[PDB]
């Protein structure tokens, strides 16, 4: 065609992401043998396409990915970590003599035949006798209500405990971890790995994991601990929706909402609205008011209804105590972790100008013409950088002359123990103050 | 992570006292038998959580 | 680089008249003696701080110049041979920073 | 042991980059994403950089 003969090359194609990935998320769960994905291998799922063809039909992982793709429409690359049922795993069995899972799963002998012909093919229980499509305790959290008898016959048992996080996911840094199992040991192991990511001895992939704990008030606290690496989501004993679907929706919403805005608290009927999850209309919001308050205190995420989409309160982590000090609300709120990660990466980027820069230590000062420096000037520059970031990264300050210190390795380590070129920066920052209780009196 | 490869090695931690001890105080009194502390032995109390035990 | 730079700087003394323990320089001669050579080398080492060497530790001890007569035994040394001992120290550069953050509220 | 790329290619790239960057600047450490980057050598996407933490 004329006017295109040189000097210009059109490349019309609708598949071009000019931004490029961003805010990766990992989903961990079990897949059935009907799939074609290698277990214990992180893979990237990039569409609401086949999925089933890779991770099986009706597996918990398949539904978790479906809900993640429902909640999140763009701006994230989604990763999956398939798992295989344990050898001794026993499938839980239910019997029906209708609402199941979420809304889109909802629907004598003639009744049963037509019902099975209308049950969704991706439902995680084989059809009236219902049998779990995966082996483990995950199948024990099924509830069927007629919006007919349903009281279960077999209880599943034995859950996988991989403990292969170091080998499987070594250095692919992640932001949000979604685990679709109620096994406390598995959640604790994920906690240990995520904490190991925040290790002073290695480069850090700052991430966060979201887990659920369903049960009565007495036992849900017994599951919790002092670790801030996970956002324990308390779920009442009579929770209708499958817990992993709610957990995955919460994780996906948090990931996509924050991504490049690592300061927004996931709250409110507009910013913490899990639209994909649907529940039957009801009055009792699970936990009682005292139960809600107790869960609020002990670092447990409480959720409530707004078909009604659910809504969460107290978007906090499970951080209640210091080493042994009680008052520590620094890492209580979930956003505090994101602020800490952003501040750390920003400070690391700023400090990059001292690579290979000649440092003239205690003995003398800089001679004319050299491009070196000394600790006092570096401390002053760091102080001014900290000052210039007030209002976006830190609070104003308490005492900047006391909250920032720079020390050479020579004057910290004993005689002949220190080595040249290494410094020690001590800094006590303060997260910016945001909206909070107003305590209106009329 | 990006640019966190050598040089800067982050050590974020909630409890890092940068001053160090200072003006120690001693409290003396009677305790019940439910405690797990050695009687007539001076010990440093970390915080308020474990005093009852 | 420091070795080749020192070799280039020391080239002025090759072929230069040198007056050993015998006596001092007389008027008009273009010679030198070990003390002045050591002083010049010491000042050159001092002037290269920040680009070749470190600041220093104690310059009165890291640089020594010795004639070959006072190193080897009697009737073993040779004229016009010098022994220079210098303890280098590379310039200090950037390294680990070890940032510690203790947030509050 | 499970290194995909042919070892001599990576070795040659490292040596060439080191010599070629230093040349007349015999002070720059060949390190960091800015300076310790072997542009020519490529690898398939992976999550396990060979050696684990202990042997690293």
């Amino acid at each position: 065609d004329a006017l295109s003969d040189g000097f210009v090359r059109l490349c019309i194609d609708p598949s071009l992401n000019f931004f490029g990935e961003g805010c990766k998320i990992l989903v961990e769960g079990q897949m059935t043998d009907d799939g074609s994905a290698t277990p214990d291998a992180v893979t990237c799922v990039t569409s609401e396409l086949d999925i089933i063809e890779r991770f099986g039909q009706g597996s918990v992982l398949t539904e978790s990915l479906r809900k993640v793709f429902c909640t999140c429409k763009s701006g994230v690359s989604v990763y999956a970590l398939p798992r295989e049922d344990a050898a001794a795993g026993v499938k839980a069995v239910y019997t029906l003599t209708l609402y199941m899972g979420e809304a889109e799963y909802a629907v004598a002998t003639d009744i049963a035949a037509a019902i099975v012909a209308a049950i969704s093919p991706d439902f995680p229980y084989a059809a009236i006798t219902l049998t779990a499509r995966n082996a483990g305790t995950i199948g024990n959290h099924l509830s069927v209500i007629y919006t007919v008898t349903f009281a279960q016959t077999t209880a599943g048992s034995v859950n996988p405990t991989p403990n292969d996080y170091a080998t499987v996911v070594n250095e692919c840094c992640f932001a949000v971890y979604v685990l679709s199992s109620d096994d406390t040991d598995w959640q604790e192991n994920l906690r240990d790995w995520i904490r190991s990511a925040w290790d002073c001895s290695k480069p850090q992939c700052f991430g966060h994991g979201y887990v659920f704990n369903k049960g009565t008030l007495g036992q849900v606290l017994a599951d919790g601990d002092n670790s801030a690496e996970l956002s324990r989501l308390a779920l009442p004993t009579t929770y209708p929706v499958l817990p992993y679907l709610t957990n995955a929706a919460y994780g996906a919403l948090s990931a996509c909402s924050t991504c490049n805005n690592p300061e927004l608290n996931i709250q409110g009927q507009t910013f913490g609205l899990l639209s994909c999850i649907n529940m039957p209309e009801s009055c009792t919001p699970g936990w009682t008011f005292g139960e809600v308050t107790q869960l609020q205190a002990n670092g447990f995420v409480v959720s409530g209804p707004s078909y009604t989409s659910p809504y969460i309160y107290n978007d906090v982590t499970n951080y209640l105590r210091d080493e042994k000090n009680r008052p520590n609300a620094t890492f209580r709120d979930a956003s505090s972790r994101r602020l800490a990660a952003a501040t750390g990466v920003a400070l690391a980027e700023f400090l990059q100008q001292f690579n290979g820069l000649a440092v003239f230590t205690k003995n003398t000062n800089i001679r004319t013409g050299i491009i070196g420096t000394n600790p006092r000037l570096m401390l002053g520059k760091i102080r001014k950088w900290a000052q210039d970031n007030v209002g976006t990264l830190f609070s104003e300050f308490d005492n900047i002359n006391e909250d920032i210190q720079l020390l050479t390795d020579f004057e910290v380590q004993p005689k002949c123990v220190g080595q040249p070129g290494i410094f020690h920066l001590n800094m006590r920052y303060r997260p910016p103050v945001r909206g909070a209780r107003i305590n209106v009196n009329m | 992570d990006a640019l966190s490869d050598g040089f800067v090695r982050l050590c974020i931690d909630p409890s890092l006292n940068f001053f160090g001890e200072g003006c120690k105080i001693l409290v003396e009194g009677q305790m019940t038998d439910d405690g797990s502390a050695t009687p007539d032995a001076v010990t440093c109390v970390t915080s308020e959580l474990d005093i009852i035990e | 680089a420091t070795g080749v730079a020192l070799a280039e700087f020391l080239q002025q003394f090759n072929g230069l008249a040198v007056f050993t323990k015998n006596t001092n320089i007389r008027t008009g001669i273009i010679g030198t003696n070990p003390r002045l050579m050591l002083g010049k080398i010491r000042k050159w080492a001092q002037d290269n701080v920040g680009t070749l060497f470190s600041e220093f530790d104690n310059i009165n001890e890291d640089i020594q110049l010795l004639t070959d007569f006072e190193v080897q035994p009697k009737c073993v040394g040779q004229p016009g041979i010098f022994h220079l001992n210098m303890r280098y120290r590379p310039p200090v550069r950037g390294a680990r920073i070890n940032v510690n953050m203790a947030p509050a509220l | 042991t499970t290194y995909p790329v042919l070892p001599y290619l990576t070795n040659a790239a490292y040596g060439a980059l080191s010599a070629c960057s230093t040349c007349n600047n015999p002070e720059l450490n060949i390190q960091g994403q800015t300076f310790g980057l072997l542009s020519c050598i490529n690898m398939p996407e992976s999550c396990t950089p060979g050696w684990t933490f202990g042997e690293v």
Binding site: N365, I366, R367, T368, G369, I370, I371, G372, T373, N374, R376, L377, L379, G380, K381, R383, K384, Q387, D388, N401 | - | - | -
Partner: protein, 131 residues
């Protein structure tokens, strides 16, 4: 080693305005016995009737005479580039300045240049012991 007035280190970093090339931080030296002169408070006051004062927004200026480096073009010292200057005094005080601009380029003889540096804010390091 207090009780002495003077500067110990002068660090200047040049950033070109059109090429965006960063040079420094290079150490400099005084051209004479006149010390660098500072002004921290970024508000200029004025006199009104009966003790009232009107606060008008202004700049934290800094007058800095230095000997130019022979490796840097003279135009960089007269307003064709940004400067990130930082000065350390003998008593431990450090003045840190970023994103500064030379406002009134005075004709220089080619060795000594007097800078009239204007920036948003100047930070004082205030040697230990404060308030």
């Amino acid at each position: 080693c207090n009780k002495q007035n003077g500067v110990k280190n002068i660090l200047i970093t040049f950033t070109d305005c059109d090429t965006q090339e960063v040079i420094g931080p290079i150490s400099h030296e005084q051209p004479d016995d006149t010390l660098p002169t500072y002004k921290n408070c970024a508000w200029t006051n004025t006199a009104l009737t009966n003790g009232y004062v009107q606060r008008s927004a202004s700049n934290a200026t800094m007058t800095l005479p230095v000997v130019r480096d022979l490796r840097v073009p003279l135009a960089f010292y007269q307003g064709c580039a940004q400067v990130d200057v930082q000065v350390e005094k003998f008593d431990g005080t450090v003045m840190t300045l970023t994103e500064g601009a030379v406002v009134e380029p005075e004709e220089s003889d080619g060795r000594s240049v007097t800078m009239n540096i204007v920036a948003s804010e100047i930070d004082e390091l205030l040697p230990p012991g404060s308030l």
